[PDB]
Structure 1
């Protein structure tokens, strides 16, 4: 792909994070802590899952960024509406304001309702995410496999400002402690 020139510098918003996440000083890395991270509760925090939003809001234009997922067993990545539900249980779907893919139990799936099987021959270590607000497109690229397309959501109905969306995945297994990292431009 030739989307690299729409690169944007994403930083994580501490205030949206689940209370067990640890965000690095530079706001470019996030990982699951082994306990509550000693922060106050607020209405922005995701309560049920280890999720956090980027600080940036997008309402026009073309945007591209990359995330490092090396050695993780589980994660969700993409964009969401600024007004998505934060508390309680919910599915990642466009109807709920999410445009996402994920890894879970050795399979990759797109967050459609119901979910769509992805066909990945080379397990990605870094994922590229492209958003075209006007066109209604969210695309995912396999940076480890020369930028090969993973999945395109088209005819998206964003219906609001978008924020970068992250889930570090649960760590019940002891094999999913590694961070999500925003990769340099």
Structure 2
């Protein structure tokens, strides 16, 4: 779409186990860990990261590649979200996400979550927000922009952040990084 937005990963939110491309456009789970600052922003608990970008208004679209990725988590979230210590990922916290785990088991971050029934495993996912509309939707690029799922009447109060994770590499097959597409 035209409402496109150039997103960079904020390393001041990145979980210590995550390696970033120097361009802030990839992110993947490292076997070992980084020994980095004591920021009130970093995700301690799980392999999660935001994008530096802050939306207070308007309509914003971006795309993410997940070729060869048995799991992942994409979407948006409030700044407000607490960044310290275990939680449930849900609209209820301040996350409007979808995700994948165990290769073929896609679900939406409703409280509680909602299994999804997808004609075509998406190779890239398109994410789209309309702050004023209370809207954020997920589109299956690899199947002619088919709506994977839409969150509606979200309560968009404070500012909003692009949310990501490449998920866990236990299976072996989650080496591959979330790659942001250039459009």
Output the TM-score relative to the length of structure 1. Answer: 0.96
* Number of the residue aligned with 2:122: 124
Q: Cα distance, 1:147 vs. partner?
A: 0.7
Q: Cα distance, 1:37 vs. partner?
A: 2.3
* Number of the residue aligned with 1:167: 165
Is 1:19–1:41's contact at 8 Å kept on the other side of the alignment? Answer: no
Which residue, out of 90, 106, 109, partners 2:107? 109
Q: Cα distance, 1:40 vs. partner?
A: 2.5
Aligned residues: 182
* Consecutive unaligned residues in structure 2, runs of 5 or more: none
Deviations for 1:60-91, whole angstroms, at most 9, x for unmatched residues? Answer: 00000000011111111000001111111111
* Number of the residue aligned with 2:16: 19
Which residue, out of 78, 83, 87, partners 1:81? 78
Deviations for 1:4-40, whole angstroms, at most 9, x for unmatched residues? Answer: 1100000000110001111101100001111112323
Moved more, 135-144 or 170-179: 170-179
| TM-align CA RMSD | 0.9
Q: Cα distance, 1:128 vs. partner?
A: 0.3
Is 1:97–1:158's contact at 8 Å kept on the other side of the alignment? Answer: no
* Consecutive unaligned residues in structure 1, runs of 5 or more: none
Give runs of aligned pairs for residues 88-107 of structure 1, distance below 5 A: 88-105=85-102, 106-107=104-105
1:46 correspondence with 2:43: yes
Q: Cα distance, 1:159 vs. partner?
A: 2.0
Output the TM-score relative to the length of structure 2. Answer: 0.97
1:60 correspondence with 2:57: yes
Deviations for 1:161-180, whole angstroms, at most 9, x for unmatched residues? Answer: 00000011011111111100
Paired with 1:168 and 1:43, the residues of 2 have a C-alpha distance of: 22
